[PDB]
Amino acid sequence: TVDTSKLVFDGLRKKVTAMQLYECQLIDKTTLDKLLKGKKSVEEVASEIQPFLRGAGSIAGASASPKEKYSLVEAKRKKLISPESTVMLLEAQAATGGIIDPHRNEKLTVDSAIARDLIDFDDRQQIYAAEKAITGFDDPFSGKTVSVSEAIKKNLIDRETGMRLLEAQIASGGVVDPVNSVFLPKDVALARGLIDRDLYRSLNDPRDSQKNFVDPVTKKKVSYVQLKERCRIEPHTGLLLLSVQKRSMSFQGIRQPVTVTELVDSGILRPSTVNELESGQISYDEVGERIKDFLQGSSCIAGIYNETTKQKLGIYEAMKIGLVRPGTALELLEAQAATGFIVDPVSNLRLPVEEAYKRGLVGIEFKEKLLSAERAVTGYNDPETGNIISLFQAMNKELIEKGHGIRLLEAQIATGGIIDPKESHRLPVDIAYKRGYFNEELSEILSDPSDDTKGFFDPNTEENLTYLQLKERCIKDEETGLCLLPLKE
C-alpha cells in the first residue's frame, strides 16, 4: 500500500482526494484500488478525468487574426464584441473555473481579475455572483453552501443568470459540485439532485431556456455550444478563442477607399468570396483583379496615337498641333474628368483636374469646365437641399444642361458603369436604379445610337458618335492599358 495522504488531486478551487473521486463516481473501484496499490499513478488517473477535475475549457477570449489575440474586455473596447455578450461570456468563465487571462494563460479569481483590469466596472457585481457557481451560495436559512440549481430555487440568484451558468458548466463537462470543487456528469448530478429535473428539462427545450447567450456581432439568441463551435484553439496554450471579424478591409475606389462591406451591397463581390478572403484562403490582389473595372472603371479615351509620326500624345497636346479641334478636345477631356482622372498616355499618369492643370496637362481655358465635369465623380451641390447629388439627379434638377449631361452619362457607362458619388466606385446598372443614380427608361435610350445621344466627334471621319462608338475605334498600349484614338496627318 502506498502513502494515502499523497493521493490528492487539484480541483477547481480545492484539493480532491481519491476517495472523493470514487464517491463522486469519477473513478471506478478498479482505478481506486490501483491507486492504493501503485498500479496506477495519480498523474496518470488525473490525465483521464481532466474535464471533471478542472473543466473541459471555456471561451477564454477572442482572436481576430490567427496570430495576435484579444481578451473579452479588449475585444469589446475595440468593438469586436458587443458589451452585452461580453458580460455573459465573462459570467461563463467565472462559473467554469474563473476569469481567464489569455495573455498569461491563467485562471483568475474575480478579485485578481479586477486587479488586472480584465473586468469592467459596471459588470463587477454580476461576475461576483457568477463566481459563486463554483464556490457555492451561502443560504441564510439553511446554513449550507448550495449550488446554482438550489440557489435558483432558494431565489438566491435570478433564473436568467442561473440558466447561463448551468448551460456553460454542462458544455464544460457537467454540473459543478461546489463543496467537492469538481465537475460531475449530467446523469450522476441528476441522481443526487445536484441539478433539478425541471431546470434540466427547460435546459434542453429550444423554446424554453436552451439558449441563454447572445451573438457578439448581431443580437441573436445563441447557445454556448454554438459559440464554442465558432472558436479557434491556440496551439501553444490550448485556449479556446472566439473567432471575431475585425473586418476593416477595403479596396481603393476613384477618390476614396471602398469597404468590402459596401462592395457586397453594390453586388460587386459575392459574400462567399469575402469571408473566404478574410480567412486568408485566397489572396487580396486576386480579388481586386476581378473587380478592377468597378473600383475605378475601365480605360477612357486617354489620348491620341498620331499614326503619321508614330507617337503617343495627350489630347491637350494634340490640339496644340492641330490634330483635333478645341471643341473636340474639350468634350474628350471632360469625359475623362467625369470618369475620375485626367490621363497622360505617355507618362501613364492619372490625376484630378487641379493636379492636371499644375503639370500642364490641361490649360486654363478648359479648367473651369473640367472642374464642373469632375463633379460627376464627387457629386453636384444642390442649391435647394444643400447636399451632394449624382450626375443623373443633377440633370433632372436642371443644374446642368441635358446635352452636357447625356455625354457624361454614356462616358461612365462605357467605362465600367454609373459612378456612385458617395461611395466612389462603379455601380452595376441594376444597383444604380435602386439608389437613383440612373434610370431604366434611359438605359435603352443610351444603348442604341440615336439622334440626341451622339454628342461626341471622330476627327478622322468627321461624324458624330456616341462615346461607346468612338471608344470602339481606339487601340491599346499593352504596357499602359489605355485607349488611344488613331489619327493621321
Tab-separated table of C-alpha atoms in Angstrom:
chain	number	residue	atom	x	y	z
A	1	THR	CA	0.000	0.000	0.000
A	2	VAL	CA	1.160	3.498	-0.939
A	3	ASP	CA	1.054	6.775	1.019
A	4	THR	CA	-2.680	7.515	1.110
A	5	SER	CA	-2.022	11.071	2.309
A	6	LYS	CA	-0.419	11.908	-1.039
A	7	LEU	CA	-3.365	10.640	-3.092
A	8	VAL	CA	-4.742	14.129	-3.712
A	9	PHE	CA	-5.850	15.864	-6.913
A	10	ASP	CA	-6.182	19.512	-7.934
A	11	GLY	CA	-9.800	20.576	-8.360
A	12	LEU	CA	-11.271	23.913	-9.416
A	13	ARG	CA	-10.569	25.573	-6.063
A	14	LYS	CA	-9.849	22.768	-3.600
A	15	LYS	CA	-7.780	19.612	-3.288
A	16	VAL	CA	-9.633	16.414	-4.176
A	17	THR	CA	-8.868	13.034	-2.609
A	18	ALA	CA	-9.092	9.690	-4.406
A	19	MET	CA	-11.990	8.706	-2.150
A	20	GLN	CA	-13.986	11.786	-3.145
A	21	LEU	CA	-13.444	10.890	-6.803
A	22	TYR	CA	-14.876	7.444	-6.080
A	23	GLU	CA	-17.834	8.885	-4.172
A	24	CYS	CA	-18.470	11.367	-6.988
A	25	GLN	CA	-18.313	8.389	-9.367
A	26	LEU	CA	-15.498	9.904	-11.431
A	27	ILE	CA	-13.325	6.816	-10.999
A	28	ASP	CA	-14.320	3.163	-10.653
A	29	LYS	CA	-13.466	0.612	-7.959
A	30	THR	CA	-10.691	-0.807	-10.146
A	31	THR	CA	-8.983	2.569	-10.577
A	32	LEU	CA	-9.264	3.379	-6.869
A	33	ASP	CA	-7.569	0.170	-5.714
A	34	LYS	CA	-4.767	0.535	-8.264
A	35	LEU	CA	-4.094	3.937	-6.695
A	36	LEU	CA	-3.874	2.385	-3.231
A	37	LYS	CA	-1.550	-0.296	-4.613
A	38	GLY	CA	0.523	1.688	-7.096
A	39	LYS	CA	-0.542	0.031	-10.343
A	40	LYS	CA	-1.854	3.424	-11.445
A	41	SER	CA	-0.265	6.802	-10.729
A	42	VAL	CA	-2.003	9.967	-9.529
A	43	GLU	CA	-0.856	11.833	-12.638
A	44	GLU	CA	-1.996	9.003	-14.917
A	45	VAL	CA	-5.510	8.977	-13.449
A	46	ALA	CA	-5.778	12.773	-13.393
A	47	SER	CA	-4.956	12.816	-17.108
A	48	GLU	CA	-8.137	10.856	-17.833
A	49	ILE	CA	-10.533	12.900	-15.695
A	50	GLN	CA	-9.339	16.398	-16.633
A	51	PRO	CA	-12.702	17.799	-17.785
A	52	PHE	CA	-14.203	16.623	-14.487
A	53	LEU	CA	-11.307	17.998	-12.448
A	54	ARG	CA	-10.724	21.446	-13.956
A	55	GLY	CA	-13.323	21.667	-16.718
A	56	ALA	CA	-13.058	20.901	-20.429
A	57	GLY	CA	-12.287	24.537	-21.200
A	58	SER	CA	-14.416	27.645	-21.673
A	59	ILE	CA	-14.179	30.524	-24.151
A	60	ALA	CA	-11.024	32.272	-22.947
A	61	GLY	CA	-11.259	35.262	-25.277
A	62	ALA	CA	-11.258	36.387	-28.901
A	63	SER	CA	-8.922	36.129	-31.893
A	64	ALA	CA	-9.344	38.466	-34.867
A	65	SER	CA	-6.201	37.203	-36.596
A	66	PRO	CA	-4.600	33.715	-36.245
A	67	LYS	CA	-1.523	35.236	-34.568
A	68	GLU	CA	-2.415	38.099	-32.223
A	69	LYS	CA	-5.327	37.620	-29.828
A	70	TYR	CA	-7.538	39.702	-27.536
A	71	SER	CA	-9.268	39.214	-24.196
A	72	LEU	CA	-13.040	39.602	-23.873
A	73	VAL	CA	-12.713	43.117	-22.451
A	74	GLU	CA	-10.154	44.186	-25.068
A	75	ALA	CA	-12.299	42.992	-27.971
A	76	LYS	CA	-15.219	44.949	-26.520
A	77	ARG	CA	-13.252	48.205	-26.417
A	78	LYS	CA	-12.104	47.539	-29.984
A	79	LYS	CA	-15.775	46.984	-30.853
A	80	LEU	CA	-15.285	43.365	-31.905
A	81	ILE	CA	-17.683	42.081	-29.252
A	82	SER	CA	-20.910	43.691	-28.020
A	83	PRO	CA	-20.964	44.833	-24.360
A	84	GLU	CA	-23.995	42.631	-23.660
A	85	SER	CA	-22.333	39.424	-24.849
A	86	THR	CA	-19.089	40.445	-23.141
A	87	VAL	CA	-20.747	40.169	-19.730
A	88	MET	CA	-22.346	36.800	-20.500
A	89	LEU	CA	-19.060	35.280	-21.673
A	90	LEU	CA	-17.328	36.577	-18.544
A	91	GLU	CA	-20.115	35.050	-16.443
A	92	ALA	CA	-19.378	31.713	-18.108
A	93	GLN	CA	-15.660	31.931	-17.312
A	94	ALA	CA	-16.273	32.632	-13.620
A	95	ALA	CA	-18.775	29.777	-13.479
A	96	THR	CA	-16.484	27.185	-15.065
A	97	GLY	CA	-13.090	27.917	-13.495
A	98	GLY	CA	-12.524	31.653	-13.153
A	99	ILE	CA	-11.771	34.721	-15.260
A	100	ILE	CA	-9.189	33.859	-17.910
A	101	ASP	CA	-6.123	35.965	-18.674
A	102	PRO	CA	-5.371	34.797	-22.244
A	103	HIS	CA	-2.129	36.792	-22.409
A	104	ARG	CA	-0.720	34.941	-19.392
A	105	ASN	CA	-2.726	31.699	-19.615
A	106	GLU	CA	-4.193	31.739	-16.101
A	107	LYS	CA	-7.390	31.110	-14.153
A	108	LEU	CA	-8.000	34.201	-12.026
A	109	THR	CA	-10.439	34.877	-9.203
A	110	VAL	CA	-12.787	37.840	-9.646
A	111	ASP	CA	-10.649	39.798	-7.168
A	112	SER	CA	-7.499	39.165	-9.210
A	113	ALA	CA	-9.389	39.868	-12.438
A	114	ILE	CA	-10.356	43.355	-11.254
A	115	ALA	CA	-6.739	43.945	-10.237
A	116	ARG	CA	-5.538	43.180	-13.772
A	117	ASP	CA	-8.319	45.163	-15.483
A	118	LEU	CA	-9.821	42.020	-17.028
A	119	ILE	CA	-13.263	43.132	-15.842
A	120	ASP	CA	-15.067	46.448	-16.374
A	121	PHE	CA	-16.553	48.491	-13.531
A	122	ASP	CA	-20.295	48.123	-14.159
A	123	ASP	CA	-20.136	44.354	-14.675
A	124	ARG	CA	-18.302	43.928	-11.373
A	125	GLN	CA	-21.171	42.744	-9.167
A	126	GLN	CA	-22.672	40.469	-11.828
A	127	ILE	CA	-19.487	38.399	-12.107
A	128	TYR	CA	-19.049	38.122	-8.332
A	129	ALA	CA	-22.376	36.272	-8.341
A	130	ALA	CA	-21.383	34.076	-11.285
A	131	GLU	CA	-18.217	33.113	-9.401
A	132	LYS	CA	-20.387	31.555	-6.691
A	133	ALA	CA	-21.362	28.864	-9.207
A	134	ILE	CA	-18.200	27.071	-8.114
A	135	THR	CA	-17.615	28.496	-4.639
A	136	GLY	CA	-21.231	27.951	-3.622
A	137	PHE	CA	-24.109	30.135	-2.465
A	138	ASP	CA	-24.483	30.787	1.262
A	139	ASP	CA	-28.119	30.140	2.160
A	140	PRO	CA	-29.020	32.347	5.163
A	141	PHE	CA	-31.869	29.984	6.086
A	142	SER	CA	-30.308	26.514	5.999
A	143	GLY	CA	-26.714	27.498	6.734
A	144	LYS	CA	-25.446	25.343	3.879
A	145	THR	CA	-23.396	26.364	0.852
A	146	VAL	CA	-25.584	25.432	-2.112
A	147	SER	CA	-25.080	25.011	-5.862
A	148	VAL	CA	-26.577	27.174	-8.615
A	149	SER	CA	-29.654	24.984	-9.106
A	150	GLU	CA	-30.557	25.249	-5.427
A	151	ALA	CA	-29.605	28.934	-5.458
A	152	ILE	CA	-32.189	29.386	-8.210
A	153	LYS	CA	-34.801	27.502	-6.172
A	154	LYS	CA	-33.935	29.409	-2.989
A	155	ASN	CA	-34.160	32.611	-5.053
A	156	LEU	CA	-30.547	33.426	-4.165
A	157	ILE	CA	-29.847	34.128	-7.831
A	158	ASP	CA	-32.163	35.209	-10.655
A	159	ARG	CA	-33.329	32.452	-13.001
A	160	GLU	CA	-31.855	34.068	-16.130
A	161	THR	CA	-28.240	34.251	-14.952
A	162	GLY	CA	-28.568	30.877	-13.236
A	163	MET	CA	-29.522	29.224	-16.521
A	164	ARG	CA	-26.494	30.733	-18.260
A	165	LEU	CA	-24.161	29.355	-15.597
A	166	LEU	CA	-25.707	25.881	-15.760
A	167	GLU	CA	-25.507	25.906	-19.560
A	168	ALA	CA	-21.862	26.996	-19.503
A	169	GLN	CA	-20.945	24.295	-16.983
A	170	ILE	CA	-22.696	21.486	-18.872
A	171	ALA	CA	-20.847	22.475	-22.045
A	172	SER	CA	-17.670	22.285	-19.959
A	173	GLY	CA	-18.272	18.743	-18.719
A	174	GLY	CA	-21.308	18.712	-16.449
A	175	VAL	CA	-22.595	20.141	-13.178
A	176	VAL	CA	-20.156	21.659	-10.679
A	177	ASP	CA	-20.174	20.295	-7.132
A	178	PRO	CA	-19.142	23.349	-5.036
A	179	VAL	CA	-18.260	21.551	-1.789
A	180	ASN	CA	-16.118	18.999	-3.642
A	181	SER	CA	-14.933	21.621	-6.155
A	182	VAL	CA	-15.298	19.228	-9.083
A	183	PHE	CA	-17.382	18.671	-12.230
A	184	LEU	CA	-19.983	15.895	-12.175
A	185	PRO	CA	-21.502	14.238	-15.276
A	186	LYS	CA	-25.149	15.088	-16.006
A	187	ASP	CA	-26.535	11.631	-15.205
A	188	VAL	CA	-24.964	11.354	-11.746
A	189	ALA	CA	-25.688	15.016	-10.978
A	190	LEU	CA	-29.389	14.343	-11.555
A	191	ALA	CA	-29.386	11.289	-9.288
A	192	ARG	CA	-28.121	13.145	-6.216
A	193	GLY	CA	-30.167	16.241	-7.031
A	194	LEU	CA	-27.188	18.498	-7.721
A	195	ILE	CA	-29.339	19.856	-10.546
A	196	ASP	CA	-33.150	19.824	-10.590
A	197	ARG	CA	-35.043	17.722	-13.145
A	198	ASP	CA	-37.276	20.672	-14.035
A	199	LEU	CA	-34.410	23.101	-14.636
A	200	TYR	CA	-32.552	20.452	-16.628
A	201	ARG	CA	-35.674	19.835	-18.712
A	202	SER	CA	-36.074	23.530	-19.528
A	203	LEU	CA	-32.374	23.500	-20.405
A	204	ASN	CA	-32.962	21.020	-23.233
A	205	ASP	CA	-36.022	22.718	-24.734
A	206	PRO	CA	-35.110	25.189	-27.533
A	207	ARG	CA	-38.358	27.073	-26.847
A	208	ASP	CA	-37.731	27.456	-23.099
A	209	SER	CA	-34.233	28.242	-21.817
A	210	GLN	CA	-31.878	26.247	-24.039
A	211	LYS	CA	-30.095	29.270	-25.499
A	212	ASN	CA	-29.111	31.785	-22.821
A	213	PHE	CA	-26.273	33.559	-24.632
A	214	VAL	CA	-26.229	36.209	-27.364
A	215	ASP	CA	-24.164	36.700	-30.524
A	216	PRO	CA	-21.113	39.018	-30.327
A	217	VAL	CA	-21.887	40.897	-33.555
A	218	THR	CA	-25.646	40.545	-34.010
A	219	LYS	CA	-28.157	40.332	-31.161
A	220	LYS	CA	-29.354	36.812	-31.959
A	221	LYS	CA	-30.013	34.379	-29.110
A	222	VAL	CA	-27.466	31.549	-29.248
A	223	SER	CA	-26.322	28.578	-27.167
A	224	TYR	CA	-22.888	28.290	-25.554
A	225	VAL	CA	-22.054	25.218	-27.638
A	226	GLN	CA	-22.812	27.119	-30.854
A	227	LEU	CA	-20.302	29.783	-29.806
A	228	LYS	CA	-17.691	27.146	-28.936
A	229	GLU	CA	-18.098	25.732	-32.447
A	230	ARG	CA	-17.016	29.175	-33.647
A	231	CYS	CA	-13.796	29.192	-31.616
A	232	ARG	CA	-10.135	28.708	-32.507
A	233	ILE	CA	-7.817	26.612	-30.347
A	234	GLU	CA	-4.458	28.273	-29.692
A	235	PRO	CA	-1.634	25.765	-30.395
A	236	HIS	CA	0.632	26.904	-27.556
A	237	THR	CA	-1.750	27.439	-24.634
A	238	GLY	CA	-4.639	25.222	-25.719
A	239	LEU	CA	-7.001	28.112	-25.018
A	240	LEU	CA	-10.415	28.487	-26.636
A	241	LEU	CA	-10.565	31.775	-28.547
A	242	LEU	CA	-13.708	33.014	-30.302
A	243	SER	CA	-13.139	33.918	-33.954
A	244	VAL	CA	-14.246	37.525	-34.432
A	245	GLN	CA	-14.190	39.586	-37.629
A	246	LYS	CA	-12.340	42.883	-37.299
A	247	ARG	CA	-13.134	43.446	-40.984
A	248	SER	CA	-11.992	46.987	-41.822
A	249	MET	CA	-10.751	45.726	-45.195
A	250	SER	CA	-11.254	47.906	-48.260
A	251	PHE	CA	-10.254	48.458	-51.883
A	252	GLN	CA	-9.225	51.824	-53.319
A	253	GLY	CA	-12.011	53.457	-55.308
A	254	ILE	CA	-11.877	56.542	-57.513
A	255	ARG	CA	-11.289	59.122	-54.781
A	256	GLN	CA	-11.585	57.148	-51.540
A	257	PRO	CA	-11.202	53.571	-50.218
A	258	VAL	CA	-14.264	51.332	-50.601
A	259	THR	CA	-15.100	48.957	-47.743
A	260	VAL	CA	-15.554	45.280	-48.599
A	261	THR	CA	-18.988	45.528	-46.968
A	262	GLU	CA	-20.040	48.176	-49.484
A	263	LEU	CA	-18.878	46.026	-52.398
A	264	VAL	CA	-21.232	43.178	-51.463
A	265	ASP	CA	-24.041	45.706	-51.029
A	266	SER	CA	-23.402	47.029	-54.530
A	267	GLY	CA	-23.302	43.439	-55.763
A	268	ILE	CA	-19.643	43.710	-56.744
A	269	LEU	CA	-18.382	40.868	-54.547
A	270	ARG	CA	-20.068	37.591	-53.639
A	271	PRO	CA	-20.267	37.131	-49.834
A	272	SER	CA	-18.747	33.664	-50.271
A	273	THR	CA	-15.517	35.195	-51.588
A	274	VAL	CA	-15.303	37.914	-48.932
A	275	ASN	CA	-15.081	35.929	-45.697
A	276	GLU	CA	-13.025	33.464	-47.724
A	277	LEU	CA	-10.637	36.376	-48.218
A	278	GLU	CA	-10.983	37.448	-44.582
A	279	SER	CA	-9.935	33.948	-43.519
A	280	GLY	CA	-6.896	34.278	-45.773
A	281	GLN	CA	-7.751	31.321	-48.001
A	282	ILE	CA	-7.458	33.455	-51.136
A	283	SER	CA	-5.296	36.473	-51.972
A	284	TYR	CA	-6.121	40.188	-51.803
A	285	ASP	CA	-4.609	41.066	-55.185
A	286	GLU	CA	-6.649	38.409	-56.988
A	287	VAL	CA	-9.968	39.642	-55.587
A	288	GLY	CA	-9.238	43.221	-56.624
A	289	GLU	CA	-8.208	41.907	-60.037
A	290	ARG	CA	-11.708	40.719	-60.945
A	291	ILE	CA	-13.463	43.899	-59.812
A	292	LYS	CA	-10.895	46.240	-61.378
A	293	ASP	CA	-13.441	47.970	-63.619
A	294	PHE	CA	-15.809	48.502	-60.686
A	295	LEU	CA	-13.316	50.146	-58.334
A	296	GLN	CA	-12.131	52.840	-60.744
A	297	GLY	CA	-13.651	51.837	-64.074
A	298	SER	CA	-12.324	50.826	-67.484
A	299	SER	CA	-9.926	52.892	-69.582
A	300	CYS	CA	-11.335	56.047	-71.148
A	301	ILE	CA	-10.242	57.722	-74.371
A	302	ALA	CA	-6.974	58.654	-72.686
A	303	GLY	CA	-5.215	60.224	-75.660
A	304	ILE	CA	-4.263	60.142	-79.325
A	305	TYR	CA	-1.914	57.987	-81.393
A	306	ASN	CA	-0.532	60.027	-84.292
A	307	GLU	CA	-0.025	57.344	-86.945
A	308	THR	CA	1.980	59.737	-89.123
A	309	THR	CA	4.775	60.285	-86.596
A	310	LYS	CA	4.146	57.092	-84.598
A	311	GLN	CA	3.836	58.970	-81.304
A	312	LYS	CA	1.589	58.746	-78.253
A	313	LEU	CA	0.351	62.132	-77.059
A	314	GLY	CA	-2.256	63.632	-74.744
A	315	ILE	CA	-5.436	65.205	-76.088
A	316	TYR	CA	-4.492	68.731	-74.984
A	317	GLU	CA	-1.114	68.360	-76.694
A	318	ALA	CA	-2.766	67.087	-79.872
A	319	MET	CA	-4.824	70.279	-80.094
A	320	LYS	CA	-1.700	72.454	-79.981
A	321	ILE	CA	-0.530	70.639	-83.111
A	322	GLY	CA	-3.963	70.888	-84.716
A	323	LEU	CA	-4.792	67.185	-84.720
A	324	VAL	CA	-8.123	67.925	-83.042
A	325	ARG	CA	-10.367	70.985	-82.792
A	326	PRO	CA	-10.734	72.711	-79.389
A	327	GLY	CA	-14.390	71.663	-79.417
A	328	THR	CA	-13.456	68.010	-79.870
A	329	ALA	CA	-10.675	68.240	-77.286
A	330	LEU	CA	-12.917	69.765	-74.611
A	331	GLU	CA	-15.613	67.078	-74.639
A	332	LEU	CA	-12.947	64.364	-74.563
A	333	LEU	CA	-11.231	65.976	-71.574
A	334	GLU	CA	-14.433	66.463	-69.579
A	335	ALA	CA	-15.263	62.843	-70.396
A	336	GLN	CA	-12.026	61.948	-68.620
A	337	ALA	CA	-12.907	64.246	-65.722
A	338	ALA	CA	-16.364	62.680	-65.491
A	339	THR	CA	-14.753	59.243	-65.232
A	340	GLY	CA	-12.338	60.154	-62.458
A	341	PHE	CA	-8.970	61.295	-63.778
A	342	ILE	CA	-7.207	63.316	-66.456
A	343	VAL	CA	-4.794	60.941	-68.175
A	344	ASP	CA	-1.345	61.422	-69.701
A	345	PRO	CA	-0.839	58.489	-72.125
A	346	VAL	CA	2.930	58.991	-72.437
A	347	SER	CA	3.708	59.144	-68.706
A	348	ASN	CA	0.814	56.881	-67.677
A	349	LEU	CA	-0.331	59.389	-65.052
A	350	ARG	CA	-3.896	59.635	-63.745
A	351	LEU	CA	-4.634	62.902	-61.957
A	352	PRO	CA	-7.544	65.060	-60.750
A	353	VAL	CA	-8.305	68.226	-62.745
A	354	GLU	CA	-6.425	70.542	-60.367
A	355	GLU	CA	-3.222	68.484	-60.423
A	356	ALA	CA	-3.526	68.114	-64.196
A	357	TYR	CA	-3.552	71.902	-64.507
A	358	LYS	CA	-0.480	72.220	-62.283
A	359	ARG	CA	1.513	69.969	-64.614
A	360	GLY	CA	0.379	71.358	-67.963
A	361	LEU	CA	-1.937	68.501	-68.926
A	362	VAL	CA	-4.830	70.981	-69.069
A	363	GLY	CA	-4.862	74.673	-69.995
A	364	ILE	CA	-6.740	77.474	-68.247
A	365	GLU	CA	-9.425	77.756	-70.941
A	366	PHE	CA	-10.729	74.298	-70.018
A	367	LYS	CA	-10.008	74.421	-66.281
A	368	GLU	CA	-13.402	75.686	-65.096
A	369	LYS	CA	-15.438	73.453	-67.414
A	370	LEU	CA	-13.354	70.444	-66.378
A	371	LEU	CA	-13.773	71.178	-62.667
A	372	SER	CA	-17.517	71.190	-63.317
A	373	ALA	CA	-17.337	67.845	-65.121
A	374	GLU	CA	-15.332	66.419	-62.221
A	375	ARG	CA	-18.431	66.895	-60.065
A	376	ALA	CA	-19.769	63.821	-61.859
A	377	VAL	CA	-17.466	61.685	-59.707
A	378	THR	CA	-17.602	63.581	-56.399
A	379	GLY	CA	-21.152	64.931	-56.516
A	380	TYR	CA	-23.113	68.024	-57.518
A	381	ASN	CA	-24.128	70.565	-54.882
A	382	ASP	CA	-27.906	71.027	-54.853
A	383	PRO	CA	-28.707	74.730	-54.189
A	384	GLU	CA	-32.014	73.780	-52.538
A	385	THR	CA	-31.155	70.835	-50.288
A	386	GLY	CA	-27.534	71.749	-49.590
A	387	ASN	CA	-26.245	68.203	-50.019
A	388	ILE	CA	-24.481	66.414	-52.874
A	389	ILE	CA	-26.432	64.555	-55.556
A	390	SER	CA	-25.414	62.460	-58.565
A	391	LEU	CA	-24.864	63.352	-62.223
A	392	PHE	CA	-28.212	61.868	-63.242
A	393	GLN	CA	-30.066	63.673	-60.449
A	394	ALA	CA	-28.312	66.972	-61.185
A	395	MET	CA	-29.510	66.612	-64.772
A	396	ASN	CA	-33.151	66.152	-63.760
A	397	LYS	CA	-32.972	69.154	-61.436
A	398	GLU	CA	-31.530	71.315	-64.225
A	399	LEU	CA	-28.217	72.060	-62.512
A	400	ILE	CA	-26.514	71.161	-65.783
A	401	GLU	CA	-27.939	71.095	-69.312
A	402	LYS	CA	-29.187	67.871	-70.892
A	403	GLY	CA	-26.723	67.715	-73.781
A	404	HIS	CA	-23.771	68.059	-71.426
A	405	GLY	CA	-25.284	65.552	-69.004
A	406	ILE	CA	-26.043	62.847	-71.566
A	407	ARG	CA	-22.497	62.676	-72.951
A	408	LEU	CA	-21.102	62.353	-69.422
A	409	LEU	CA	-23.523	59.545	-68.557
A	410	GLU	CA	-22.668	57.384	-71.569
A	411	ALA	CA	-18.995	58.045	-70.837
A	412	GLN	CA	-19.378	56.441	-67.408
A	413	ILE	CA	-21.389	53.508	-68.775
A	414	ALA	CA	-18.764	52.845	-71.454
A	415	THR	CA	-16.028	52.756	-68.814
A	416	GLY	CA	-17.463	50.376	-66.222
A	417	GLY	CA	-20.836	51.853	-65.308
A	418	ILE	CA	-22.611	54.621	-63.402
A	419	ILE	CA	-20.388	56.335	-60.830
A	420	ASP	CA	-21.570	56.351	-57.217
A	421	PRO	CA	-20.657	59.856	-55.963
A	422	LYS	CA	-20.853	58.906	-52.271
A	423	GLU	CA	-19.039	55.559	-52.397
A	424	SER	CA	-16.633	56.435	-55.221
A	425	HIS	CA	-16.993	53.305	-57.362
A	426	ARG	CA	-18.838	51.968	-60.409
A	427	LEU	CA	-22.298	50.521	-59.791
A	428	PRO	CA	-23.985	47.712	-61.717
A	429	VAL	CA	-26.794	49.170	-63.848
A	430	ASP	CA	-29.344	47.494	-61.560
A	431	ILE	CA	-27.933	49.000	-58.359
A	432	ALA	CA	-27.950	52.478	-59.905
A	433	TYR	CA	-31.726	52.140	-60.264
A	434	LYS	CA	-32.232	51.404	-56.566
A	435	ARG	CA	-30.114	54.331	-55.384
A	436	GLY	CA	-31.496	56.611	-58.090
A	437	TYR	CA	-28.232	57.417	-59.854
A	438	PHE	CA	-29.713	56.312	-63.177
A	439	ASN	CA	-32.958	55.351	-64.922
A	440	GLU	CA	-34.124	52.205	-66.715
A	441	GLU	CA	-36.054	54.482	-69.074
A	442	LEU	CA	-32.689	55.947	-70.080
A	443	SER	CA	-30.512	52.836	-70.321
A	444	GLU	CA	-32.261	51.736	-73.513
A	445	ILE	CA	-32.026	55.241	-74.966
A	446	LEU	CA	-28.266	55.417	-74.441
A	447	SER	CA	-27.937	51.810	-75.613
A	448	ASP	CA	-28.874	52.329	-79.260
A	449	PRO	CA	-27.182	55.278	-81.043
A	450	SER	CA	-29.947	57.832	-81.611
A	451	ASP	CA	-30.300	61.461	-82.695
A	452	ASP	CA	-29.742	63.097	-79.304
A	453	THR	CA	-27.110	60.706	-77.962
A	454	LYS	CA	-24.297	61.229	-80.486
A	455	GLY	CA	-22.570	64.101	-78.694
A	456	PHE	CA	-19.007	63.051	-79.484
A	457	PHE	CA	-16.898	63.542	-82.599
A	458	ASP	CA	-14.433	61.486	-84.648
A	459	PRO	CA	-11.738	63.730	-86.202
A	460	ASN	CA	-10.873	61.010	-88.739
A	461	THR	CA	-14.240	60.561	-90.441
A	462	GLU	CA	-15.847	63.795	-89.200
A	463	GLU	CA	-19.022	62.096	-87.972
A	464	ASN	CA	-20.925	62.421	-84.698
A	465	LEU	CA	-20.775	59.323	-82.499
A	466	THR	CA	-21.658	58.108	-79.022
A	467	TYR	CA	-18.793	57.707	-76.554
A	468	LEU	CA	-19.007	53.934	-76.964
A	469	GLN	CA	-18.883	54.191	-80.763
A	470	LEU	CA	-15.747	56.333	-80.583
A	471	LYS	CA	-14.147	54.153	-77.896
A	472	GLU	CA	-14.569	51.098	-80.137
A	473	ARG	CA	-12.392	52.832	-82.736
A	474	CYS	CA	-9.465	53.092	-80.321
A	475	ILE	CA	-6.407	50.880	-79.857
A	476	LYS	CA	-4.486	49.783	-76.761
A	477	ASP	CA	-0.950	50.229	-75.444
A	478	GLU	CA	-0.112	46.871	-73.870
A	479	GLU	CA	2.003	48.436	-71.116
A	480	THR	CA	-0.479	51.141	-70.069
A	481	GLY	CA	-3.834	49.546	-70.873
A	482	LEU	CA	-5.036	52.882	-72.232
A	483	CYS	CA	-7.298	53.503	-75.224
A	484	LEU	CA	-5.745	55.738	-77.880
A	485	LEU	CA	-7.563	57.144	-80.906
A	486	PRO	CA	-5.574	56.595	-84.143
A	487	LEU	CA	-5.069	59.757	-86.211
A	488	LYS	CA	-3.304	60.714	-89.436
A	489	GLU	CA	-1.889	63.915	-90.955
